[PDB]
Amino acid sequence: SRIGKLLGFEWTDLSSWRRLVTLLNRPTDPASLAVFRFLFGFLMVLDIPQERGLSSLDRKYLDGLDVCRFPLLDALRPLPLDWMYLVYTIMFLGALGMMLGLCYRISCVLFLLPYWYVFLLDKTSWNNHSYLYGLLAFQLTFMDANHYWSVDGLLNAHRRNAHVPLWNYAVLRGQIFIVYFIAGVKKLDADWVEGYSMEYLSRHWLFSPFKLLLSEELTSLLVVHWGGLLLDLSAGFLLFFDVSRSIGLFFVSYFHCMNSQLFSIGMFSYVMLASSPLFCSPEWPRKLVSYCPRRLQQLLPLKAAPQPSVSCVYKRGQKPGLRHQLGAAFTLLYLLEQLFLPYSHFLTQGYNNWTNGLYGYSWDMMVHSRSHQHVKITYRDGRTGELGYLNPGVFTQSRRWKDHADMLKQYATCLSRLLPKYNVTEPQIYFDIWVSINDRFQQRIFDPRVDIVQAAWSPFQRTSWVQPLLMDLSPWRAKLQEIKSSLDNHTEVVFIADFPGLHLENFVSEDLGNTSIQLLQGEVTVELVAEQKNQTLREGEKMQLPAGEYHKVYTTSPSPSCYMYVYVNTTELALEQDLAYLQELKEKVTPLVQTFLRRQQRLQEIERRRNTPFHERFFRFLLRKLYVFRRSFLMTCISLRNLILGRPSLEQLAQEVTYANLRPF
Amino acid sequence: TVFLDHENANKILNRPKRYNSGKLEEFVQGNL
Ligand SMILES: *[C@@H]1O[C@H](CO)[C@@H](O[C@@H]2O[C@H](CO)[C@@H](O[C@@H]3O[C@H](CO)[C@@H](O)[C@H](O)[C@@H]3O)[C@H](O)[C@H]2NC(C)=O)[C@H](O)[C@H]1NC(C)=O
Ligand SMILES: CC(C)=CCC/C(C)=C/CC/C(C)=C/CC/C(C)=C\CC1=C(C)C(=O)c2ccccc2C1=O
Ligand SMILES: *[C@@H]1O[C@H](CO)[C@@H](O[C@@H]2O[C@H](CO)[C@@H](O)[C@H](O)[C@H]2NC(C)=O)[C@H](O)[C@H]1NC(C)=O
Ligand SMILES: *[C@@H]1O[C@H](CO)[C@@H](O[C@@H]2O[C@H](CO)[C@@H](O)[C@H](O)[C@H]2NC(C)=O)[C@H](O)[C@H]1NC(C)=O
Ligand SMILES: CC(C)CCC[C@@H](C)[C@H]1CC[C@H]2[C@@H]3CC=C4C[C@@H](O)CC[C@]4(C)[C@H]3CC[C@]12C
Structure with a gap:
């Protein structure tokens, strides 16, 4: 019917389990699946030395190194460095076998198991594209992607140019759509819609054409944010339908090429570029091979029609066997889980923090940008009671722990087990981390008064010591930008929102002469620790601060207060004046x-x-x-x-x- | 370099090492 020509199937094919399994295991051309398999294997082969970390294993998993690692499960530990290199070798061999379709099932497992071991070994290495690579490997493990352009076909028949179940393409296309659509739904966030997530991306020269017509401010909103959101929302629909497939392919290819030249996202853009022709006809590589403008089809794969394969259900009875039922059930359950997992943060609330869930599996790429102003890792020795301070991220190889209560708990436990080596026993470790998400007021993400080491974190309970993101101060951001625009080239401003009962102890370095704090909202008592002098500020009051001395800004308002630090770094200013004098002396010479x-x-x-x-x-x-x-x-x-x-x-x-x-x- | 003194740990206005616009998606080159 009309839906048959529009959706690729009929409604009668969803009548019962028999019809649905016959549809999902419908014989399709293996050519597009094979080309995507080759491209994915090649891209993973290139990604293993670059992003996965084969070129930095000795710097990461060095034996004897005292390092705080962040596995998803604390029982998951890395192997010795030589065994980690062996694991990466197995991953590389599996990716190569996937690329060449050589021992395809075995190669898929040999890439999948090491890849997910490495992925779960460090929650700080999680990206949406790394999670996508893991997902694609997991799917392609169960797909008959060795049925075309593969060494498996050259080595044994019944896999050489053989039909594949339709559900292979169904799952691959569904995963790609899910990526696009859930990316768009996550980009329906107010920060992305209002243009706050990436307002400095349009400054790139790649956006020069739009700058011809649109302003820099308008390019970042219409093209980067509204254009990107619209592309993500409509990409799956454009690619799926035939009438719009050409325009969708062009738009998606432009999107991915720009993302490849705009962000250091490894092979993400190339993986999605390879996945785009999955929505095309499954025999498109067969069409290209058949064309053979240079008559090179001898080297190219077989151009003959695919042979029948027992993986598919052929209408004739030929009732589906067990493998077809498993394929259909895998399609349904996997697509349901892929639609649900980005929105399962109501279950795992121990990873919610400000932006819900662990980063990597929600397709929330480039939606939330964090700018950390300061990190103070205080400790209190359990025996002596002496107060000490740690270098932020001293034993960590990443900095994502600053934004996650799960990783903060892991970091504090690792610090509590390592610090006895450095003479600090039973450390009560407090973290005072100031984060600004999407150009908001810098505020504490975690309670600085709580001993994370002994604080309670659970995978399915909301963390009590995560400070709520002050969303009520989001409208202030525009005014903040105005202030940032009003300053000179030698003046800097830090916008800080503090919670009631909490104080910010700040040491203004002797270099930062001419520093001042202006109260924007609420009330703060500034205490000159050195002079032991308390001054209460009203909204709009500016107080000069001594350089080279401590001061404590207490938030005495019942509601979170907002203030700004306007500092000049006058040592650098005098250095610039002296440098100008030297430059004039050289000019006279x-x-x-x-x-x-x-x-x-x-x-x-x-x-x-x-x-x-x-x-x-x-x-x-x-x-x-x-x-x-x-x-x-x-x-x-x-x-x-x-x-x-x-x-x-x-x-x-x-x-x-x-x-x-x-x-x- | 494991420990910090009172002054350096409480230096909020200290300039960060680089312009902080972390997206958690772009791979950190040489994160190890
Ligand atoms: C206030 O401005 C002064 C500039 O006079 C800043 O001090 C200077 O900071 C730079 C780096 O930002 C230093 O350069 C480098 O120092 C390191 C450590 O010694 C070393 O790799 C090299 O010696 C290199 O030159 C510089 O030495 C330092 N001092 C001077 C006199 O330039 C200061 O950081 C600014 N304060 C704030 C809070 O930003
Ligand atoms: C409104 C209008 C006139 C449109 C027509 C003409 C326009 C201006 C066309 C569209 C070109 C633009 C300007 C496209 C997007 C820029 C984007 C910057 C960022 C977000 C983003 C990034 C960075 C990724 O890496 C990524 C990876 C995988 C899936 C999704 C994403 C993703 O979403
Ligand atoms: C300390 O720094 C601030 C900001 O850099 C200086 O404030 C400037 O004051 C002049 C005086 O007319 C104004 O024209 C500028 O617009 C101000 N800049 C602002 C508000 O960003 C202040 O003068 C400096 N103090 C000293 C003693 O030099
Ligand atoms: C300046 O005022 C702040 C609050 O307005 C004082 O902070 C309190 O100090 C007392 C000690 O007498 C503590 O018991 C309270 O818990 C503190 N309040 C907090 C931390 O919110 C501060 O002591 C005053 N300092 C001076 C020199 O007057
Ligand atoms: C030592 C261990 C960690 C290595 C063994 C690999 C195991 C644990 C891997 C291989 C395949 C993986 C799965 C592949 C795909 C999915 C779907 C995704 O939406 C959530 C994760 C999940 C469910 C993965 C969980 C981990 C997994 C089961």
Whole structure:
């Protein structure tokens, strides 16, 4: 009927389980599935040395390193460095087998298990694209993607140009739609709609055409935010329907190319570019091969019509077998779970914090931008009682713990187990972290008065020591920007919102001369700790602050107060004046001369970087990528030899390591 | 570098190491 030509199936095919399973296991062309499989395998092969961390395993999983790691399950621990290299080797072999369709089921498992082990090993490495890679591997494990353009077809029949169940394409297309649509629904957030998430992205030269017609402020709203939201919302619908598939392909390809050249998101854009032709006809690669403008189809895969495969249900009775029922059930359950998981944060409230859920599985890319002003990790020794302070992120290899109560709890537990080594036993560790999400007032995300080490965190309970994001102060942001615009090139402002009963102890460095605090809303008592002087501020009152001395801003209002710090960094200002004097002296022609020389060298380097021709920057990029891949391979070989043939002498290990890190050119 | 003194730990107005616009999606080059 009309829906049959529009949806690719009939309503009668959803009448019962038999009809639905016959539909989902309908014989489809394996060509598009195979091409996506090859592209995904190739992109994962390239992604393993770059994003996964094969080129930085020795810097990450170094043995003997005292490091706070953030696994999803605290019982999940990394293997020794050599065994981590073996795990990455297995992942690489699995990705290569997926790319070539060689031992496809085994290769899919060999990529899937190490990939998800690494993914769950660190919650701070989670991205929406990394989660997408894991999802695509999980699906492609159960798909017959080796039925075309694969070595599995060259090695054994019944898989060479053989039909695949329709549910393979159904699940892949459903996953891609889900990514697009749930991305759009997450971008329905007020910060994205109002233009707050990425208002500095339109400054990129790639947005120059729109700047011809739209202003910079209008380009960021209409094109980056409204355009991006509209693209995400309508991408799946455009790609699905045939009449709009061409325009949807063009729009989606433009979106992904721009995202590839705008963000360092690894292979995300290329993965979605490869996934876009999944919505096309399954025989599109077969059509391209059949065209053969250069008559190169001998090297290209088979162009003949696919052979019948037992994976599909052929209408004739031919009732579906168990594998077809499992395929249909997998399609339904997997798509339901993929629609539900981005919205399952009502269940796992221990990961909610400000932005609900762990980052990585909600398709909320680039919606929430965080700017952290300060992080104070206070500790109190349980035996001595002496108060001490830690370097923020001292033992962490990432900084995501600053935004998550789960990762903060893990960090505090790791600190409580490590700090006895550094003479601090039974540490009561408090975290005072100031975060501003989407250009809001900087405010504490966690309670600074609570000992996280002993604080209660549960995976399914809302965290009591997470400070609520002051959304009622969101309208202030516009005014904030005005203030930021009113300042000079030598003046800086920090906008701080503090909760009642909480105080901000701030040491203004001696460099920051001419610093002042202006109360924007509420009331704050500023205490000159050094002078022990209390001054209550009214809304709009400006108080000068002493440099090189402590001061404590207590929020005495019943409601959260808002103030700003206007500081100049007058040491740098005097340095600039002296540098201008030196510049005038040079034009007429100790430490200040050294600073002038350093500034001149920096300017010369900046000029030289732009002076590099586009072929030179590209060749530098190729050399950097070649070095990364070579180092990955060589350290992998070192660790594999250490595992099979044993670790050689320390001198020989040093020689091999210094050979691995040697630049190719 | 594990520990900080009272002054340096309470330096809120200290300039951050870099312009903070973290998106949690862009891969941090050399995060290790
Ligand atoms: C206030 O302005 C002064 C500028 O006079 C800032 O101090 C200067 O900060 C820079 C780095 O931001 C220092 O440069 C580097 O210092 C490190 C540590 O010694 C080292 O890698 C090099 O020596 C390099 O030069 C610089 O030394 C330092 N001092 C001076 C006199 O320039 C200060 O950070 C500003 N205050 C705030 C709160 O921003
Ligand atoms: C309104 C109008 C005139 C439109 C027509 C003409 C316009 C201006 C066309 C559309 C080009 C724009 C300008 C497209 C989007 C820019 C976007 C910056 C960001 C968000 C975003 C990023 C960064 C990702 O990496 C990503 C990855 C995977 C899935 C989703 C996403 C995602 O969503
Ligand atoms: C401390 O810094 C502030 C801000 O940089 C200075 O305030 C400026 O005062 C002049 C005086 O007319 C105004 O024209 C500017 O518009 C002000 N800048 C602002 C409000 O951002 C203040 O003068 C400085 N104090 C000293 C002693 O130099
Ligand atoms: C300045 O005022 C603040 C509050 O307006 C004082 O902070 C309180 O100090 C007492 C000690 O006498 C504590 O018991 C309270 O818990 C503090 N309130 C807080 C932390 O919100 C501060 O002591 C005053 N300082 C001076 C020098 O007058
Ligand atoms: C040592 C361990 C961690 C390695 C073994 C790999 C196991 C745990 C992996 C392999 C496949 C993975 C699953 C693949 C896909 C999904 C769907 C997604 O929406 C949630 C995660 C979930 C459900 C994954 C959970 C973890 C998983 C089951």
